[PDB]
Amino acid sequence: KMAKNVDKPLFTATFNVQASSADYATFIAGIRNKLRNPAHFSHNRPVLPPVEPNVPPSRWFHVVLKASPTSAGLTLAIRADNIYLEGFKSSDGTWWELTPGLIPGATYVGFGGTYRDLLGDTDKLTNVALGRQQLADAVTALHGRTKADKPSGPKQQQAREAVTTLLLMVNEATRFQTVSGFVAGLLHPKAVAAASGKIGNEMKAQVNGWQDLSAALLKTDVKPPPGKSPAKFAPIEKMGVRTAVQAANTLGILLFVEVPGGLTVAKALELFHASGGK
């Protein structure tokens, strides 16, 4: 029941933490593009393929975050079905995991990868500073981890904060155009003052309801039964998303959700494979 292919990524996306806002946007867009089910879009936004049933997580990608174009970078191990971060590789080659016993040969980092684990409450996302130095510092803290370090409260807290930073600036940014645009807006050239900022309640609610928002948009694609007008988008006011157009502009990539009258897990995977998906 351990994960498979963790170190056999389907692709590797790389970002230099000193690179331009434009390059950051390109990096995030590339991840969405490589994750997509070519056979399944909703309102011209990519949908992930379904999670493969009755096997452990076997589809992974890597993100490499580098201090400079020449530097060895921090490697993130992320699921290619739901974009969950489960592991990261430090400079000494150690694989660290966020779920005990999930990744073969990995060392458990001592805390889990949910926001409740990292922050105490999912309501605390609005407290997390985002910005270029936060990214750099997160990379430094995790990349510099060694197997033989003795842990302390402070190192563990630094590690939780670094993971939280990467989750927002990589994983949530991949999921949400709102988040990726906000992060991109905080990245500036060297001649501009160092910058940082925090997300508002709308983006917090989006991050906390990715499946909900994905499902709500997917429902609008379902062809209506005989006699019916097409399904209308149901506003999620807390996310500030009231229309399907707003939902499309918000979603970076959709989590696959089985909705009534929509594609099943098996059928969407069939189409994924038929279209060349791995």
UniProtKB/Swiss-Prot annotation:
Gene Ontology BP terms: defense response to fungus; killing of cells of another organism; negative regulation of translation
What PROSITE patterns is this protein classified in?
SHIGA_RICIN (PS00275)
Listed under catalytic activity are: Endohydrolysis of the N-glycosidic bond at one specific adenosine on the 28S rRNA
Q: Which UniProt keywords apply?
A: Acetylation, Antimicrobial, Cytoplasm, Fungicide, Hydrolase, Plant defense, Protein synthesis inhibitor, Toxin
Catalytic activity, EC = 3.2.2.22
Active site as annotated: 172
Q: Which cysteines are joined by disulfide bonds?
A: none
Q: Output the Gene Ontology terms for molecular function.
A: rRNA N-glycosylase activity; toxin activity
What sections of the protein cross the membrane? none
Cell location: Cytoplasm
Enzyme class at the top of the EC tree:
hydrolase
GO CC annotation terms, alphabetical: cytoplasm
Question: What Pfam families does the record tag this protein with?
Answer: RIP
SUPFAM superfamilies the record matches: Ribosome inactivating proteins (RIP) (SSF56371)
Gene3D superfamilies under this entry?
Answer: Ricin (A subunit), domain 1 (3.40.420.10), Ricin (A Subunit), domain 2 (4.10.470.10)
Q: What else is known?
A: Three similar RIP 30 isoforms I, II, and III have been described in Barley.
Tell me its family. Belongs to the ribosome-inactivating protein family. Type 1 RIP subfamily.
The free-text function statement in the UniProt record for this protein reads:
Inhibits the elongation phase of protein synthesis. It inactivates fungal ribosomes even more effectively than mammalian ribosomes and is thought to function as a constitutive antifungal agent in plants.
* UniProt-recorded name of the protein: Protein synthesis inhibitor I
The record lists the organism as: Hordeum vulgare
